[PDB]
Amino acid sequence: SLTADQMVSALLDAEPPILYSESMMGLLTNLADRELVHMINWAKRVPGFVDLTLHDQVHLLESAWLEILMIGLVWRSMEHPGKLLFAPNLLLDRNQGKEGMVEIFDMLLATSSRFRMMNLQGEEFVCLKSIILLNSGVYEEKDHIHRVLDKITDTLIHLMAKAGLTLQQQHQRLAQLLLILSHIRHMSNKGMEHLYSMKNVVPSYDLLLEMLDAHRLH
Amino acid sequence: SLTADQMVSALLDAEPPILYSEYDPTRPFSEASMMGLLTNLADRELVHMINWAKRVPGFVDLTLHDQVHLLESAWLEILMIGLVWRSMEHPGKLLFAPNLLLDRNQGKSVEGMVEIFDMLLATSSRFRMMNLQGEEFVCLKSIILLNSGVYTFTLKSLEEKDHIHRVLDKITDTLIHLMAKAGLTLQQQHQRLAQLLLILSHIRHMSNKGMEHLYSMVVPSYDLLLEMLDAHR
Numbered sequence: 001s002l003t004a005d006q007m008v009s010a011l012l013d014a015e016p017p018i019l020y021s022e023s024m025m026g027l028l029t030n031l032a033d034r035e036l037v038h039m040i041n042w043a044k045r046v047p048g049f050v051d052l053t054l055h056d057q058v059h060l061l062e063s064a065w066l067e068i069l070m071i072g073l074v075w076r077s078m079e080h081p082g083k084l085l086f087a088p089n090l091l092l093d094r095n096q097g098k099e100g101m102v103e104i105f106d107m108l109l110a111t112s113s114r115f116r117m118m119n120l121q122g123e124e125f126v127c128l129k130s131i132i133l134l135n136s137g138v139y140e141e142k143d144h145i146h147r148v149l150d151k152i153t154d155t156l157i158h159l160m161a162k163a164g165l166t167l168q169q170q171h172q173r174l175a176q177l178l179l180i181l182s183h184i185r186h187m188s189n190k191g192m193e194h195l196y197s198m199k200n201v202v203p204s205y206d207l208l209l210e211m212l213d214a215h216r217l218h
Numbered sequence: 219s220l221t222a223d224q225m226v227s228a229l230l231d232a233e234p235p236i237l238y239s240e241y242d243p244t245r246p247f248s249e250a251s252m253m254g255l256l257t258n259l260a261d262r263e264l265v266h267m268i269n270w271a272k273r274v275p276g277f278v279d280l281t282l283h284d285q286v287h288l289l290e291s292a293w294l295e296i297l298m299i300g301l302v303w304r305s306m307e308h309p310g311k312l313l314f315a316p317n318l319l320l321d322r323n324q325g326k327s328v329e330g331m332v333e334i335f336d337m338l339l340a341t342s343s344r345f346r347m348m349n350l351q352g353e354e355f356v357c358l359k360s361i362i363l364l365n366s367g368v369y370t371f372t373l374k375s376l377e378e379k380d381h382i383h384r385v386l387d388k389i390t391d392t393l394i395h396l397m398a399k400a401g402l403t404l405q406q407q408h409q410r411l412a413q414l415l416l417i418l419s420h421i422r423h424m425s426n427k428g429m430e431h432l433y434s435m436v437v438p439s440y441d442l443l444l445e446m447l448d449a450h451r
């Protein structure tokens with residue numbers, strides 16, 4: 001029932017903290033592992049997410065977590081051309097990423113470049129992250145997921161109309177942003193292949209369920 | 219310069235034919251021959267896919283090298299979305315060809331096959347739930363061709379990317395025009411545009427899972443794609 005403005009405010013307020021790094025792959029794995037609980041706290045504040053069953057919340061997180069870590073990384077790195085800001089004390093260039101790592105590193109750098117070129121705004125970024133969370137695992141509960149996604153679409157169009165875009169420019173920018181989500185899914189698929197080529201790769205159902213911190217009256 | 223109506227007409231006229239598998243009423247269907255039949259069909263469809271791509275407005279303005287890169291990135295997503303479209307009116311079945319209509323129990327002979335079979339069936343069910351129209355389908359296939367390779371490609375590269383983005387914006391305008399013509403309100407137009415484009419993320423996912431499956435058992439070479447795209451006059 002939130003207005004578009006209330007939805008943006010809710011998502012901006014829900015943003016996770018930026019964590020610091022504590023051998024490169026052990027540092028990156030540990031950082032991702034610590035980002036996960038913050039991602040779950042964020043997910044619980046995306047309007048509509050907690051109306052799903054806990055089972056469905058876990059299945060959406062299992063499908064979206066890697067895309068969500070990647071989009072956050074690309075967002076943090078936008079203002080750092082040619083580098084990836086994993087953490088404020090962990091800025092890497094592609095030379096440090098040099099088997100199979102540099103290909104994904106370049107895919108992420110290219111996303112960051114695209115966001116910088118489109119002048120992606122924070123209010124649009126938090127809508128896109130929310131769409132990843134609700135859409136990556138979708139293919140009563142589905143009806144609700146689709147209603148949330150429709151509300152996020154409305155909210156994106158609202159932000160672009162507020163910025164003064166014509167209707168044509170609004171639908172063109174909406175499409176440009178949603179096409180970037182297909183590239184984020186592609187990078188997550190390649191990134192999973194890369195992680196399975198090296199290695200406990202995905203968070204277990206029970207780990208995610210524990211972090212969701214279920215209510216005590218079942 | 220094309221109007222949205224001219225874009226739709228060009229894309230509908232470019233559609234490839236629906237190809238068949240071998241007929242022989244003395245050879246009952248066998249699970250052991252299934253992969254060979256599917257490989258033979260995909261290879262024949264690829265030739266028509268190159269003819270189709272050359273007819274997608276703006277595609278042949280790119281360099282050959284970039285045309286090949288786009289097709290290398292998109293060919294399996296394009297085969298998969300065509301299969302989903304051909305299957306849309308056949309719940310529970312994948313219509314590889316009119317004489318090769320399979321259910322998921324036939325997908326169980328090969329390790330890893332049924333998971334991809336189920337993702338394709340789910341996409342077909344989504345197309346039915348959205349009542350996807352043929353004019354929208356041809357737009358989505360063209361977006362896949364232009365978009366899937368654009369993030370993995372100099373001043374010439376910058377000019378190509380700009381052109382690709384301009385053609386993709388034209389296809390967006392064309393999808394919105396079709397939705398407006400169908401009577402949808404402005405809110406429903408944006409919502410449906412977003413629903414359709416989010417399905418492209420699922421198609422990408424299925425292509426990546428599909429590629430891993432084909433290598434478990436490969437793909438068109440740059441020279442072959444270059445050879446079919448690199449035509450003489």
Ligand SMILES: CCCN1CC(Oc2ccc([C@@H]3c4ccc(O)cc4CC4(CC4)N3C(=O)c3ccccc3)cc2)C1
Nearest residue numbers: 028029031032033069073101104105191200201202203
């Ligand atoms: C048990 C479940 C979790 N564990 C399994 C482990 O999964 C991981 C997930 C992420 C990463 C890091 C990382 C960290 C933090 C971040 O915010 C973003 C990323 C981006 C990213 C691509 C994914 N990555 C790479 O290392 C990388 C590889 C190639 C090129 C560029 C990056 C490492 C391991 C953690």
Ligand SMILES: CCCN1CC(Oc2ccc([C@@H]3c4ccc(O)cc4CC4(CC4)N3C(=O)c3ccccc3)cc2)C1
Nearest residue numbers: 256257259260261297298301331334335428436437438
């Ligand atoms: C020189 C290289 C030639 N290579 C052979 C070609 O690779 C192939 C491409 C496609 C397919 C077929 C196929 C055929 C026609 C079609 O229109 C769609 C599909 C869908 C598809 C998923 C991809 N598939 C499966 O078999 C399948 C697997 C799991 C679940 C369901 C389907 C087989 C081989 C290129």
